[PDB]
Amino acid sequence: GGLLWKIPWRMSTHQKTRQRERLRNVDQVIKQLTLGLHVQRCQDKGLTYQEAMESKKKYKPRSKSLRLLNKPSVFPKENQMSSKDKYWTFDKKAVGYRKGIHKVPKWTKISIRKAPKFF
Amino acid sequence: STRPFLVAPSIANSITTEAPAINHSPELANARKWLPKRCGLITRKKGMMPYFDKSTGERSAATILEVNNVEVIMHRTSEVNGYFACQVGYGSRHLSKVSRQMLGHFASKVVNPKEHVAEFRVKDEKGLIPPGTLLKPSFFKEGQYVDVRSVSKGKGFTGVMKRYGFKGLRASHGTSIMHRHGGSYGQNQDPGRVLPGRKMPGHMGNEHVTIQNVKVLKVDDENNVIWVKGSVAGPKNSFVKIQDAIKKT
Amino acid sequence: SQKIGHSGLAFARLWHHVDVARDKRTLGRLASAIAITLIGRHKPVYHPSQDCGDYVVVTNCQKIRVTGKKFEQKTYWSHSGRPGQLKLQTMNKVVADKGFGEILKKAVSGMLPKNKLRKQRLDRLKVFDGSENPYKQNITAFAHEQSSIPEPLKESIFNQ
Amino acid sequence: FKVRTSVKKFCSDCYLVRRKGRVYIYCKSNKKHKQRQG
Amino acid sequence: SQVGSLPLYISPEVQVSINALSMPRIIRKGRTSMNISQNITVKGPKGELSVEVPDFLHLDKDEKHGKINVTVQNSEDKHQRSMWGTVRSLINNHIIGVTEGHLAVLRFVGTGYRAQLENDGKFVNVKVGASIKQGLDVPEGIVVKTPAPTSLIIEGCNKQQVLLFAAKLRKFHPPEPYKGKGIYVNDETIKLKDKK
RNA sequence: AAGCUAAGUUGAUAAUAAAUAAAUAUUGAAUACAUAUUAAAUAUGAAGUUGUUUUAAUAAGAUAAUUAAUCUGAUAAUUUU
RNA sequence: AGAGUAGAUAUUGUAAGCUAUGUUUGCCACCUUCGACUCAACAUUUCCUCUUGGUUGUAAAAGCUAAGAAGGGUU
RNA sequence: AAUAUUUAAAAUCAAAUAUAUAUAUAUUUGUUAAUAGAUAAUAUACGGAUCUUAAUAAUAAGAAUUAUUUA
RNA sequence: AGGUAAAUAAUCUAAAGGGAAACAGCCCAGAUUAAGAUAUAAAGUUCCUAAUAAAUAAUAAGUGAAAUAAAUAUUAAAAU
Ligand SMILES: [Mg+2]
Ligand SMILES: [Mg+2]
Ligand SMILES: [Mg+2]
Ligand SMILES: [Mg+2]
Ligand SMILES: [Mg+2]
Ligand SMILES: [Mg+2]
Ligand SMILES: [Mg+2]
Ligand SMILES: [Mg+2]
Ligand SMILES: [Mg+2]
Ligand SMILES: [Mg+2]
Ligand SMILES: [Mg+2]
Ligand SMILES: [Mg+2]
């Protein structure tokens, strides 16, 4: 290994904060998507925008992917997530079966919340 | 009446504390030093001749160091100069030769215009000789040991064989054009440079040389010479310092 | 418009005292603080192209704070160029040789920007192991501060 | 002294000491049980 | 803790005082610190001697029954608790020394193994199998005396100093195992090996 | 013969001192014992370290003289230490 | 494990286990001269010299083994 | 206090979210540290300086390391 | 193996700019020409060097501080 890819094995505090913020943003996006759908469905039934926003009973999304994203068991929120799953991917060939998320290529775009139950 | 001045509280209200003594101070260095308890005298190496011991019969080569107008010009002290030393002056010189400033200095110290001046550093204030006095060969005792400083014979631009005792290359068996050369002068690229102090041809001799623990064979105030056992660095008429041996008593 | 006027006072080299006995900062933090002053970053008239930093007189430098076991561990290096001449001195040894002021100076040097003005900036730092120093008389002072100081002390300082 | 990475006390008369940033095991009875952790 | 809690008995002739130092010094550890302020003294018949001690520690002198106690400001602080047991023990040792005096018998074992007072008590010459002469000067406070040539006695008010001196004396020739042979401080023993 | 030379001659292998390494101790808790302390105190300890000694460089400081009928240098000549 | 008159750990240490080194023989293919003489510089994983621990297997003397140690020396 | 394991949130408990709802069900989160082991050849090599705080005493410093976070 | 052989994606190839000390291929981001007020990305905010203040724990080993070295040993700490 003569070429030096000087990437540290762990993240800095600032990196971790940025990661957390990014995670929070994707959750927010999902929430917005569900909310807009609900609003649209209220409008279709025949309420005003404000009335729809007020509504006690929020409509859950019917499409599959959205419904999965909504579930925390499948796609957890940043507040829900463990410290470890925010900053460590599962890597079967690593010692500890764990690897920094920053070592994943395009980790800033690519999402990866859920690790295996005991790894 | 008083002049205008302002003073900072930070510098006024600063609690007074003396600085700790440092190794690279003069006074610490002086304390460390291995120095003789007595002054010395400047001499000239007049030549060299045999000394026969009349009891045993043993012959010893002795250098004849002449002592002429040797005089304590002034001396230095720890409080002013940082060390204790006696500025000795040897011989007599013309007006013509000596600088106006030097002549004035000699007049102030009340000595004749001098042929060679040199310091002789000592341990204590007790070792200092009163200034103006004349130092004669009887200063030293016969059989005592002395250190001897002088500038060696100049050998000119010398080779590595004469300088450093390099073996050189062979005389025969193919040897071409490099019989007295130093051979290799380094290493292929790790250093990529001839490293400092690589023994190379250069000027040799004409440097100072202390010779320690030389025995004072004979002292006589009549002929104005100190006999000293063995060799002394430099040519004839070269100036030679003489002080008690620090190593030998 | 803002720049136009008499600028002589802005570019004036002031003299800044720091009684190390009073100051509670550790060595490195103190050195870092000094470095800024030496550069002239504290003053708004500053420009990178112009050296416009103040003098810093450090005093009672024997009472400088050093954390951990750095006083007996921390090694200062040196090398001429000739191999086998790496000179490694521990902090305490360096102090014994020169002083705590030398140590501070080294820190300050390392803090400073590496260019032709660095040496000048380093020179402006004036460090002293104990209290007494020649620059006592030239530290910045004000008339409003004079009531705090007792009467004869000022006279003694002036005499000194 | 047996200078080694592993430093266990052998007999009851052995006693462990922590000096100079090194675990020593001295012993009052058997002098062979003297060990040092690196 | 268990040591420091034990109260010290005093006889009327001896006085255990305490007072602040002229210039208190601070011991600085990595994280923790320890400021030596107070200075305990144990004055008595044979002599007087002192212990420089931290600020957190302080005595509790009772008039009744001649007892005095020692306590720290925080026993749950580990360093303080460790100091407490030490200091109490030290002042007990001092008390013992000033009232009775500490003793250290050295018995020399070997053919021509013996001690001698050379400089009128001020230098214990020790001859223990060496061409060169061996020995060392007695410190201040220590008084040495030789009932026999082969049985020296060191005596002093400080338990620390006397026993250090004894150890130094021994260090010229500690007991060999093959022949019980050397310098034995107090009740010192050695398991003799089989000759073979 | 001088000179130059080693086959020759003379001298040196630079102390005392200081702090240390492994190692050896003192008193002594934390931890009723024990423990040289990876606690506070107190000691020993190396052809090593710091130094010391020697050489070269540098020039803080010091003595003196200060527009010169002979101030200080250089150019020039006769030279070799 | 096992040798070591007895006792695995004075000294020895099967086969299997965990590392370091880049001093050997390889593998890869980014990259197209052995020895002698002369002068050596550096490292320490120390052969000698200095200090020291262990050695029913240190009585002594020779050793054996281990810790510190690169100042000087090493046909 | 002593002996012997484990270093764990699966179970268990605690806390939080979502469905009927002062409760139940389902989901999510929370379970050690230091040192030694440690190691070669131009030169210390976190990029370098340097970073572990301290009452008296500051209009004032007190990780610039690791872990979980906030603005 | 900086090895070799192919599979998928990206970049380099042919991509300048910021970060990763320096850096073809990593992390951001695609230079039409300027301007430099506002949002920023990755990465940072004691000084060198543009920018910082806090909270709660732990470390005392300069451990570590942008390239994590193993079995094992010792000393603690929790829970049973
Ligand atoms: Mg020849
Ligand atoms: Mg020819
Ligand atoms: Mg000879
Ligand atoms: Mg006890
Ligand atoms: Mg004991
Ligand atoms: Mg020595
Ligand atoms: Mg067997
Ligand atoms: Mg095997
Ligand atoms: Mg023997
Ligand atoms: Mg070694
Ligand atoms: Mg030396
Ligand atoms: Mg659970």
Ligand SMILES: [Mg+2]
């Ligand atoms: Mg290195």
Ligand SMILES: [Mg+2]
């Ligand atoms: Mg960095």
Ligand SMILES: [Mg+2]
């Ligand atoms: Mg390839």
Ligand SMILES: [Mg+2]
């Ligand atoms: Mg091409």
Ligand SMILES: [Mg+2]
């Ligand atoms: Mg690019």
Ligand SMILES: [Mg+2]
């Ligand atoms: Mg492209």
Ligand SMILES: [Mg+2]
């Ligand atoms: Mg474009």
Ligand SMILES: [Mg+2]
């Ligand atoms: Mg480090």
Ligand SMILES: [Mg+2]
């Ligand atoms: Mg690193």
Ligand SMILES: [Zn+2]
């Ligand atoms: Zn034992």
